[PDB]
Design a binder for this molecule. Sequence first.
Ligand code: CL
Ligand code: CL
Ligand code: CL
Ligand code: CL
Ligand code: CL
Ligand code: CL
Ligand code: CL
Ligand code: CL
Ligand code: CL
Ligand code: CL
Ligand code: CL
Ligand code: CL
Ligand code: CL
Ligand code: CL
Ligand code: CL
Ligand code: CL
Ligand code: CL
Ligand code: CL
Ligand code: CL
Ligand code: CL
Ligand code: CL
Ligand code: CL
Ligand code: CL
Ligand code: CL
Ligand code: CL
Ligand code: CL
Ligand code: CL
Ligand code: CL
Ligand code: CL
Ligand code: CL
Lengths: 219, 219, 219, 219, 219, 219
Amino acid sequence: PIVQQGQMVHQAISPRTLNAWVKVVEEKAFSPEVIAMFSALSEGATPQDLNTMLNTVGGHQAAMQMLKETINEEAAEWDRLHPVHAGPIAPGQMREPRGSDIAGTTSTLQEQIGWMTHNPPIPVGEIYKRWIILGLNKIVRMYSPTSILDIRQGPKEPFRDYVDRFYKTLRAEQASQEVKNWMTETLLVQNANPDCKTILKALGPGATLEEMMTACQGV
Amino acid sequence: PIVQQGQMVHQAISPRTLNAWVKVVEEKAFSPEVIAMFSALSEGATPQDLNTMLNTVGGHQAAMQMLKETINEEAAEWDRLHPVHAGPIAPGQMREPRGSDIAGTTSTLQEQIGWMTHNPPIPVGEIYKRWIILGLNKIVRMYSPTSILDIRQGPKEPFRDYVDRFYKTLRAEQASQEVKNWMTETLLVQNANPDCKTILKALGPGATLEEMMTACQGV
Amino acid sequence: PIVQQGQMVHQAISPRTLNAWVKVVEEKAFSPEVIAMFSALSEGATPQDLNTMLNTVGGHQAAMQMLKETINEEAAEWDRLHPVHAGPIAPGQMREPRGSDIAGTTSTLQEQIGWMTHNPPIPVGEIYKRWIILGLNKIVRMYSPTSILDIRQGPKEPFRDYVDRFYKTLRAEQASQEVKNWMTETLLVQNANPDCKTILKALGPGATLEEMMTACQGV
Amino acid sequence: PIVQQGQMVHQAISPRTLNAWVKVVEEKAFSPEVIAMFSALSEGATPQDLNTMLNTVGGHQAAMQMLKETINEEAAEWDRLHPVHAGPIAPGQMREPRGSDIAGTTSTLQEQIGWMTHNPPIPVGEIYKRWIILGLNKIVRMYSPTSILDIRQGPKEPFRDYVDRFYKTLRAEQASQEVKNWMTETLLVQNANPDCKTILKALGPGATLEEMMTACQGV
Amino acid sequence: PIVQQGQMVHQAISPRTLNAWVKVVEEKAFSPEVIAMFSALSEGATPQDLNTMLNTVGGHQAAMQMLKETINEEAAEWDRLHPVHAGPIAPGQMREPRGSDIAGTTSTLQEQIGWMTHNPPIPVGEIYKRWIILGLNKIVRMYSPTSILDIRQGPKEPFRDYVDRFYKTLRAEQASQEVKNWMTETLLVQNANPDCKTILKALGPGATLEEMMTACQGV
Amino acid sequence: PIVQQGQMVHQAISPRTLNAWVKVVEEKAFSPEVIAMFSALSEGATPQDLNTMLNTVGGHQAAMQMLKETINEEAAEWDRLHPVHAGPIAPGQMREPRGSDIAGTTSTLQEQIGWMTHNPPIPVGEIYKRWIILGLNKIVRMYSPTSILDIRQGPKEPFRDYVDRFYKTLRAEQASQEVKNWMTETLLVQNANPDCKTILKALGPGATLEEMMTACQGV
Ligand SMILES: [Cl-]
Ligand SMILES: [Cl-]
Ligand SMILES: [Cl-]
Ligand SMILES: [Cl-]
Ligand SMILES: [Cl-]
Ligand SMILES: [Cl-]
Ligand SMILES: [Cl-]
Ligand SMILES: [Cl-]
Ligand SMILES: [Cl-]
Ligand SMILES: [Cl-]
Ligand SMILES: [Cl-]
Ligand SMILES: [Cl-]
Ligand SMILES: [Cl-]
Ligand SMILES: [Cl-]
Ligand SMILES: [Cl-]
Ligand SMILES: [Cl-]
Ligand SMILES: [Cl-]
Ligand SMILES: [Cl-]
Ligand SMILES: [Cl-]
Ligand SMILES: [Cl-]
Ligand SMILES: [Cl-]
Ligand SMILES: [Cl-]
Ligand SMILES: [Cl-]
Ligand SMILES: [Cl-]
Ligand SMILES: [Cl-]
Ligand SMILES: [Cl-]
Ligand SMILES: [Cl-]
Ligand SMILES: [Cl-]
Ligand SMILES: [Cl-]
Ligand SMILES: [Cl-]
């Protein structure tokens, strides 16, 4: 990665960042917390470090291939919006990057460092990072076993655990924040068990989750 | 985070800070020492690092949603007290942050760094940190199984263990320091077993905890 | 903490310092080596880092409350000896700290850093550290099960192990160095088994521990 | 390695980089993720650090000898393309390296540092690294047990696992990207079980892997 | 410790240095490799760091008391050879240290840093370190179970293991290098079993250990 | 060690370098990868750090004594080739080192640092390192159980494992690169089982190890 005297300086990815990432993928497979951990360990990372984290993943090669295809689609879109102009790169200048240069496959470390440290800066690491997080979101969608519509509270299930399951499944859903707001406003109270459902409906439509959980504590 | 030649310099969150936090949440669930550990690992942290620590938490998504709602309430309060003024940001200036900018959802890393390193400084990391600790206190309240009124000394229980339980439950209570002072002055001596209660009452109302524990040592 | 180009620079407490301290308290409970480890891990620490180490302790809340009361007594004594003078803090100056400012409860990180880096320096971290070590000494006193007067050598016990026990119990005793010198000069030879006691008395009152241990080696 | 004030500074290889590499070779034997981990841990490395990583490998000495022979072939090719010219090295100059100087066997650390920090730079570490990755690719080829032509989907095998196996075996194949593209376009759909094969053929030749996996989800 | 821009800068003792030392004392008790590890972890250490390493030792308080007495004897000797002169410390000067100042009991961290960074330097850390290593040598002497005169080769014992035992016991012996040279020249060949003894005596008095071990390989 | 602003700066040996070395010697005893690990962990090391690594080795004191004798022989040879000249060391100069000064037994840390940072540099650390690696090579020779002449392929042994054994034993042999080349050209094909031997002889005398291993894959 690169960390900011004032100037931004280059640095190699640490061995325990790599070991942490590999352990995370080995243990947790693909889940939202794996994506959060990815963005955590890849702060200020170059495309070389991102490809470094991706290529060290053993197994799960179906998901890795899906991620490759997503990255290729985003790169082709970048090439459509940003057409490269033929010509000689002038002294004191750097070429404009392609989608493959952002993915680190056709660019050198010096070129990525120059794009990132330039003023104005071309943040290739955060763009490639954006594409990677997109594909990872697709993977987490495909590998989620349950749908949010099937999360129902058991007859003897404490409301707390039911909320744990509900928002666990909701975090993996692929829907805009408005759709998830609707799911919270409708499905959470709708799919509770009758004993808790009646009380929550007695609370009102504008209650917080704290009030809903403290209401069905005894039930 | 950011650490202070004299100037404050930016730095990425370390992998063992993240691993420490994730291990803490996995092992201890939600307790006061988890909050102390959070403030410990988040010294000088930016909102990006705070969201980094929060999003890497697997499970406990009910508590995470409650924390989201609390953060949204504090952000709306900030927006009420601090209304943004429409206009063009002048050269050599930075915009005043919203509640969502403090929460790191609508602000960039450069903007947070600029707000924190400015003179006068706008400490967005400590404000967002304050909100997070508030919501975490609410969670620790809701998830505490026992009330302080139910902590009673067993007939054969050593006074030391009874004090351990009493202040363990007291640390999770949500009450001002004056209320907790009253609880110490009344409930601790009131709820001891008769053999120790009579001796402590023979000591007097102004004895320290050291004197109370060394008094009921033999009992 | 703060580490000394020549200038003293601030730094956040490391995650493995915290993990080391928490592991120490979890494993060893309260013993002299725990205090030595505390002073070890808290070299150059600010009151914020000291409160950081104290608040991360799970359990043992009776001892933590005793430590709080001791810190409050030392703070009240500081307030008695150092009365604050009402007035406006002049430009280029910093206010004189209270006992609560030394304990880090009513002071900011910038104020502690300014007090510590000033010339003349107000070492709030070493003062608060002194109070903490005092209270910890009180706790170690209260939680010591055995008295030094009860450490007696068994009939078949090697003298070496008896000395191990004797100085183990002596390290936890609360007595000035002169009293401990008297205990070494009297109780050690007095409480040995007769076979070793007679030989040690044949050595003389001015023998070293090396000579005493090498004398009763065969016995 | 060497990390970039602006100047490139030398640094010794860290003990946990070495321990990470040795653990990787001990656990995973020879696989593509081992190569990715090698390039990960050897960012900015000198030939001395590369030989350091190679020589610390216990066992697998057949593969290490094959790697030695490959490195010798690449070095002889470098000597053929770059003939050394006899003469005295002028003041303010450095000799042009041989293949053995790139492999670090006949060059000193100061000479490698000088070649890498020079302008124009002679990147001996990335050249030797290239040769090493070449030989490692040969080894991974030889030690792959299965061919891509034999990866067939079981009758009750979920399509996801079959894709995992297919691209796992494909990653170890030695073929240009065009040949692997043909393998993806032909063998993947050809070697699926009939129930999934018919559906995938109903999709069309231009479907993505995401669509192919979400199509045969229920089958 | 203190590490050398050119100037010597102060630094706090690392948590894994402490953990390493504590683990070493817990596992290996008192042996020569423990002393080597002490000098290893205490490179450039101040008396505060040395007392830090010593006080964190749990148990073995007999040996710790012996070490205290040895340190006190060396300190009294220093006070005899270096008498302090009464007077006022002049501006731009520092007082000459006592034996207790070298032991870190009556001196501050600033005074130790000033003594060590001065020109001419007063190396209090290496002097106190010398005393500590002396006392540790006394302890290792007292706690050695076997004498070098009792190390004899078994009838079926390989010569290699017998040499391992011989020099293991010899490393713990308290004798000058000349005495140990005599022990090597006499006892090693004298105490071997007859089958190996006759061959070694056939070699001659001037053979190396390599020749002696390769001679009795088959026996 | 010492790491290169441009100037070479001194640094203490890290605790995990020491722990890594001690673990390596404890686990692997004496093998070539132990020597590679030694040179790995001792990059830029001073004689004090080399003696630090050597003295922390518990057990194996026969090998350590052999290493001492080898170091003494190399030191005596250095004294023969480099005779010290009697006289006063001039201001702005440093004395020429003896063999014992290179071994770190009769020289201080400041003298080693001065010898290494001087221009022209006297690399005492790499010289002492050379001697240590020499003695370690002698030890690895003596402790190798098998000779290269006895490595023969089993009747049902895969050729790959036989090559593993062959080059494992060859790496521990003490022979010049030409002798080892002859061993590769003769013994490897000579000592294979008849089924593989005939095929390898059908290949020809100029085949690579890759071709030899891929030829006897099916056998
Ligand atoms: Cl690291
Ligand atoms: Cl790869
Ligand atoms: Cl998967
Ligand atoms: Cl852009
Ligand atoms: Cl579920
Ligand atoms: Cl780290
Ligand atoms: Cl998230
Ligand atoms: Cl929870
Ligand atoms: Cl503000
Ligand atoms: Cl309880
Ligand atoms: Cl750390
Ligand atoms: Cl707290
Ligand atoms: Cl306790
Ligand atoms: Cl003061
Ligand atoms: Cl006891
Ligand atoms: Cl390291
Ligand atoms: Cl090697
Ligand atoms: Cl292998
Ligand atoms: Cl080139
Ligand atoms: Cl397979
Ligand atoms: Cl550390
Ligand atoms: Cl102590
Ligand atoms: Cl002991
Ligand atoms: Cl001196
Ligand atoms: Cl023995
Ligand atoms: Cl370290
Ligand atoms: Cl030693
Ligand atoms: Cl051995
Ligand atoms: Cl030289
Ligand atoms: Cl073998």
